[PDB]
RNA sequence: AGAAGCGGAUUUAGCUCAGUUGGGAGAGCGCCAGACUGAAGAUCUGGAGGUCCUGUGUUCGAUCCACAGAAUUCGCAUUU
RNA sequence: CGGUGGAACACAGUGGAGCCUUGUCCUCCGGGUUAAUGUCGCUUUUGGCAUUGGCCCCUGCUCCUGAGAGAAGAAAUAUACUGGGGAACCAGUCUUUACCGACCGUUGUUAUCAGAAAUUCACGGAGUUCGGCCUAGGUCGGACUCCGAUGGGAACGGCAACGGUUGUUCCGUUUGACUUGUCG
């Protein structure tokens, strides 16, 4: 006979607050410009995809770019989709973490729409890292990023004790 | 070089606590060479003239808020110390203190067989089996302090959130428990002959 | 299939042990972060020690952890991987995360998406 | 208050004693309470009650296994 | 806890009986050199493979026993490995002029869950090599290597028991001096 037993297991007490994805609102004003720009990149020539706009869409190149090889470009922006199925959780639990230790001004934007499976199915993987050094796009990227899309860290900034979190899991035991 | 040190965590911890003592001795030598008694001028003097020597020096001013607040808040949550104090239960609290780890505690040598060990306050960076490791500041001394536990009495204050009205003070004895924290998680402490505790009646 | 019994009387000894484990994890993580934000690797063999002691306490009272903790900490030297060496992907395998000591913790990511751990599934978990 | 030296057995709830692939810490009696009786005993139900002699170490985890330190107690053709 | 005064230097202290695999002058595996043979490539001849024969490869010390303590420069910084100690160091597995190293085999166990899997069952992916259909190199089978979220965990790792050592097992003493009794 099978009996269900609840076992107490210690949770990471701050992983919910470490994965508090930033507050994004009035976001359909942004996907129009972003998707139109990405399509206009991806139409003509694979060299002309990355020749006027330098962007990296492979996670190994994201790690090698944020390691410290290129230090000139200080404003560098990232776009990562959450709340979207068919997206790996192994990278997604480490993407907002690796950008924190980067000395460059890296600006993560979490895309909140679940229906946005287009950018993953089209370009590479569903993430986008590019540079706003002298491009035209920064002329609106600096406009809205101060409004709603602010990214700051409250969790490591001040000194604060954290309460413990002990959860409990299901276990089916046959006897 | 870096891989051969951290192959075992205990040996690298021993190398670090030896390097801190050697750097403290070099700091005392450079301080007598400096002839300045102020420690805030001494730290800037080391920052100006000795960059590689400054790298392994401890930072007690950083060490106090990063440890004391977490330790006091953990004890206020664990022992159920709240604004309501008239519902306290002491035996279960002493059992929890027997079960809680003292890694990161502020602790004071109040009585000892050696007359020079007393008066030392310090914060735990690691609990040994039969010795004890703390850190204390002097005028210019920042040495990692090793103190024996066989024949010493230790005390620690548990504050209450009210200001200057009431606070608690508890005491442990390192000659009583002489084991690792790992064994202390499972050990149920029992009676002893306690014949060698005459010093606690003597001084 | 069987009997459905959901007890919320948590036991006091298990709460003491998991509070001890969580305090060791918090003090090790905060030592590591307070050292890592300011300057170079000063006492990186120190905080690791706590984690090792934590894992040994996890060996004592038969306790299990979420895969977030064991994914964070190492396996052999048992250190925190908040600052790892390198992260590589699609290098003819799935994924690789290198460390300073040389022990790697890889994950099968090139097979298929939408795979979750047993503690991360929809109904298997009840908080507090 | 009848030693000294030798072999065997053995210590677990207040008591008498089980028990152990090594993963739960128990039974009888006693105490308290319920049930029952005019009342009480007996019978029956439930609860309280632990330094598994102590310590090391092995192991993922000890009443159990290994070592160390104590001892309990029987026998030596006896009832002193 | 031990052993000696019973064994005479292993003469297993000696004798007898029973059984069998009937007590094999045997064999360490393993590494190096030399000689012979056969195959394959260079062509006085050399190189690689397999077999056979010959040689070489280390009682640390005292002691009958029990046991005691010495040092780990033939690969390391901590002086072989593992865990702790505050350090001389302690405990367990080991080796000792090893001018080459050598953790014996079998059986069972590691409970529930988890995971593909709790013992080199199996399963999934990638790479290499070979064979068949076949020839823009597609598929199938066999072998090897590496990886796969879980748990202390995949490590022929940890624990317990047993032996092939010169065949096993059983039985008896080699231990006494005075007093008394019998027998010659
Ligand atoms: Mg005597
Ligand atoms: Mg005696
Ligand atoms: Zn590591």
Swiss-Prot record, chain A:
Top-level taxonomic group: Eukaryota
InterPro entries registered for this protein in UniProt: RNase_P_Pop3 (IPR013241)
Alphabetically ordered keywords of this record: Nucleus, rRNA processing, tRNA processing
A Pfam family per the record: RNase_P_pop3
Gene Ontology process terms (BP): intronic box C/D snoRNA processing; maturation of 5.8S rRNA; nuclear-transcribed mRNA catabolic process, RNase MRP-dependent; rRNA processing; tRNA 5'-leader removal; tRNA processing
Cysteine pairs bridged by disulfides in the record: none
Subcellular location: Nucleus
Cellular component GO terms held in the UniProt record: cytosol; nucleolar ribonuclease P complex; nucleus; ribonuclease MRP complex
Role of this protein: Required for processing of 5.8S rRNA (short form) at site A3 and for 5'- and 3'-processing of pre-tRNA.
Miscellaneous comment in the UniProt entry for this protein: Present with 1360 molecules/cell in log phase SD medium.
Family: Belongs to the POP3 family.
Assembly and interaction partners: Component of nuclear RNase P and RNase MRP complexes. RNase P consists of an RNA moiety and at least 9 protein subunits including POP1, POP3, POP4, POP5, POP6, POP7, POP8, RPP1 and RPR2. RNase MRP complex consists of an RNA moiety and at least 10 protein subunits including POP1, POP3, POP4, POP5, POP6, POP7, POP8, RMP1, RPP1 and SNM1, many of which are shared with the RNase P complex.
Designated name of the protein: Ribonucleases P/MRP protein subunit POP3
Curated annotation (Swiss-Prot), chain B:
Domain of life (superkingdom): Eukaryota
GO BP annotations, alphabetical order: intronic box C/D snoRNA processing; maturation of 5.8S rRNA; nuclear-transcribed mRNA catabolic process, RNase MRP-dependent; rRNA processing; tRNA 5'-leader removal; tRNA processing
Single Gene Ontology MF annotation: ribonuclease P RNA binding
Signal sequence annotation: none
Cellular component GO terms held in the UniProt record: nucleolar ribonuclease P complex; ribonuclease MRP complex; ribonuclease P complex
Keyword check for Nucleotide-binding: no
Function description: Required for 5.8S rRNA and tRNA processing; associated with RNase MRP and RNase P.
Oligomeric and partner information: Component of nuclear RNase P and RNase MRP complexes. RNase P consists of an RNA moiety and at least 9 protein subunits including POP1, POP3, POP4, POP5, POP6, POP7, POP8, RPP1 and RPR2. RNase MRP complex consists of an RNA moiety and at least 10 protein subunits including POP1, POP3, POP4, POP5, POP6, POP7, POP8, RMP1, RPP1 and SNM1, many of which are shared with the RNase P complex.
Stated name of the protein: RNases MRP/P 32.9 kDa subunit
Span of the entire protein shown here: 77 to 279 of 279
Swiss-Prot record, chain C:
Free-text cofactor note: Binds 1 zinc ion per subunit.
Main location, first listed in the record: nucleus
Tagged with keyword Hydrolase: yes
Any one annotated GO CC term: nucleolar ribonuclease P complex
Keywords linked to the UniProt accession: Hydrolase, Metal-binding, Nucleus, tRNA processing, Zinc
Subcellular localization: Nucleus
Pfam families (alphabetical): Rpr2 (PF04032)
Binding site for Zn(2+): 74, 77, 99, 101
Catalytic activity: Endonucleolytic cleavage of RNA, removing 5'-extranucleotides from tRNA precursor
UniProt-recorded Gene Ontology molecular function terms: metal ion binding; ribonuclease P activity
Known EC number: 3.1.26.5
Single GO biological process annotation from the record: tRNA 5'-leader removal
Enzyme class: hydrolase
Cofactor: Zn(2+)
Additional facts recorded: Present with 2070 molecules/cell in log phase SD medium.
Family indicated by similarity: Belongs to the eukaryotic/archaeal RNase P protein component 4 family.
Subunit structure of this chain's protein: Component of nuclear RNase P. RNase P consists of an RNA moiety and at least 9 protein subunits including POP1, POP3, POP4, POP5, POP6, POP7, POP8, RPP1 and RPR2, many of which are shared with the RNase MPR complex.
Function: Component of ribonuclease P, a protein complex that generates mature tRNA molecules by cleaving their 5'-ends.
Protein name: Ribonuclease P protein subunit RPR2
UniProt lineage: Eukaryota, Fungi, Dikarya, Ascomycota, Saccharomycotina
């Amino acid at each position: 006979k099978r009996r269900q037993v609840y076992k107490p297991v210690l949770d990471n007490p701050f992983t919910n607050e470490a994965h508090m994805w930033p507050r994004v609102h009035d976001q359909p004003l942004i996907w129009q410009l972003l998707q139109s720009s990405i399509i206009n990149k991806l139409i003509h020539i694979q060299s002309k995809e990355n020749y006027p706009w330098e962007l990296y869409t492979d996670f190994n190149e994201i790690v090698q770019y944020l390691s410290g090889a290129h230090g000139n470009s200080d404003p560098v922006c990232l776009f990562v989709c959450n709340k979207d199925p068919d997206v790996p959780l192994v990278l997604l639990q480490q993407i907002p973490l690796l950008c924190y230790m980067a000395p460059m001004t890296v600006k993560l934007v979490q895309l909140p729409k679940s229906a946005m499976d287009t950018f993953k199915s089209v370009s590479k993987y569903g993430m986008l890292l590019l540079r706003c050094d002298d491009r035209v796009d920064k002329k609106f990227v600096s406009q809205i990023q101060k409004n709603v899309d602010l990214l700051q860290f409250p969790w490591l900034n001040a000194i604060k004790y954290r309460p413990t979190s002990v959860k409990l899991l299901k276990t089916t035991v046959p006897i | 070089d870096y891989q051969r040190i951290n192959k075992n965590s205990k040996i690298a911890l021993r190398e670090y606590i030896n390097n801190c003592k050697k750097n403290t001795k070099k700091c005392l030598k450079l301080a007598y060479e400096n002839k300045i008694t102020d420690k805030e001028d001494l730290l800037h003097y080391i920052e100006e003239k000795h960059p590689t020597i400054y790298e392994s020096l401890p930072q007690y001013v950083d060490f106090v808020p990063m440890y004391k607040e977490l330790w006091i808040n953990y004890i206020k949550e664990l022992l159920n110390i709240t604004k309501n104090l008239k519902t306290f239960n002491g035996s279960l609290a002493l059992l929890k203190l027997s079960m809680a780890d003292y890694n990161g505690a502020l602790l004071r040598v109040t009585k000892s067989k050696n007359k020079t060990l007393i008066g030392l306050q310090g914060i735990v960076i690691w609990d040994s089996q039969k010795f004890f490791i703390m850190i204390v500041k002097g005028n210019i001394i920042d040495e990692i302090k090793c103190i024996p536990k066989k024949g010493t009495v230790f005390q620690f204050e548990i504050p209450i959130s009210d200001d200057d009205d009431s606070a608690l003070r508890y005491s442990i004895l390192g000659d009583r428990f002489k084991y690792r924290s790992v064994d202390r998680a499972g050990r149920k402490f029992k009676s002893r002959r306690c014949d060698d505790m005459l010093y606690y009646i003597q001084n | 299939n069987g009997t459905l019994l959901v007890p919320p009387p948590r036991t006091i000894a298990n709460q003491d042990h998991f509070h001890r484990l969580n305090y060791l994890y918090q003090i090790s993580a905060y030592q590591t972060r307070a050292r890592q934000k300011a300057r170079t690797d000063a006492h990186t063999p120190l905080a690791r020690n706590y984690i090792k002691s934590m894992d040994l306490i996890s060996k004592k009272t038969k306790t299990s952890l979420l895969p977030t903790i064991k994914r964070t900490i190492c396996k052999k030297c048992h250190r925190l991987l908040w600052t790892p060496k390198k992260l590589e992907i699609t290098s003819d395998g799935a994924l690789s995360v290198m460390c300073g000591c040389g022990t790697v913790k890889r994950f099968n990511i090139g097979a298929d998406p939408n795979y979750r751990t047993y503690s991360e599934r929809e109904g298997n978990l009840l908080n507090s």
